[PDB]
Amino acid sequence: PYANQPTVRITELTDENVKFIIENTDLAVANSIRRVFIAEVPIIAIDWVQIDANSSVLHDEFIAHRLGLIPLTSDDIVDKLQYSRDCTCEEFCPECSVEFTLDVRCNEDQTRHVTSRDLISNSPRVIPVTSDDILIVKLRKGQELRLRAYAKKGFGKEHAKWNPTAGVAFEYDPDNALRHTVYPKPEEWPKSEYSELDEDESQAPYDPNGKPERFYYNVESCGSLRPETIVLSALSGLKKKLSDLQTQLSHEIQSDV
């Protein structure tokens, strides 16, 4: 009737990829945790850009989109900065957003590559991922680019530039045991990475009393957030959403009674 007892085991914790296994958990819980990874994890990204001078062949909208989808590190201060909509500050303030200044001018014969390194911030804890660098626009001689950009706080439901993951992979029941997929020719399908069968066997035998469990994750960050703190941020966001649901449901049930 109550919550069960999940266990976690970590198989790889490199600088940009994390694989972990969650056991003793229903399918919907793991699916929701996967969904929150790519939709509702807070991150700092550029949303407000102001173009002062743009003589490039790449016009204003190209540059605005490319600067919007440049990832920004938010490993520690993503919790500190509030949302711009919830800020009592009007328009923007340094407490509610991060200001970016970009100024570049080409006066040489060879092509100037305006990359993400040329972006200059005010807070040193927000910077594009250079600590190869991301190309933005190439300039010929005599072509300038001057702009100011503001970075807000948002998650993946608004826009894909606020999606912190590179790409999440979600595997449960690796060798087929619950017949959640019906293979017409089981011998023609490659074994999974986490399969536990020999070469002769194709699928696991039928389990009528089984239940989907032992989920395999292969979540991968885009270099903005660390690939181990993204899971903690996702779980914290889910917990805060359900606490808000607690408060709203309690208010409604005291209002009705």
């Binding site: 017949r179 019906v182 039928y206 009528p208």
Partner: protein, 148 residues
Amino acid sequence: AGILFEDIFDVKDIDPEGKKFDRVSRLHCESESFKMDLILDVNIQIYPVDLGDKFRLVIASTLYEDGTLDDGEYNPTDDRPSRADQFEYVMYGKVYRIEGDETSTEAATRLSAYVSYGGLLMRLQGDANNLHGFEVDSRVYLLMKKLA
């Protein structure tokens, strides 16, 4: 006591027309005591079955074994009247046709009752003194268990 049919059956055919559906197989059965043949569709992945296997069959209107009607609603929290749970395979369905061998002169020297378990069907040729409990448009249950 609510039991409409009591018999012990044995199988000889698993799929004489072929393996039509992957998860449903069509059994062919007959008894050894009162000589009624049987055909039946049984799920396979939740219930293995093979040739030469002996089982006894119970067909009852209600599982309560008290004569009280259940009215056909799923009540998982109503296990208080101690339903017929000692048998390990339970179906639920209705009849749709009861036809026999009439020549409009005598009265049903043999009866063949058709029962639909939501698509899984059976059929029971036999004497009318064993199949007179079945009435058209009536909800019935099916009980299965293995025998040694």
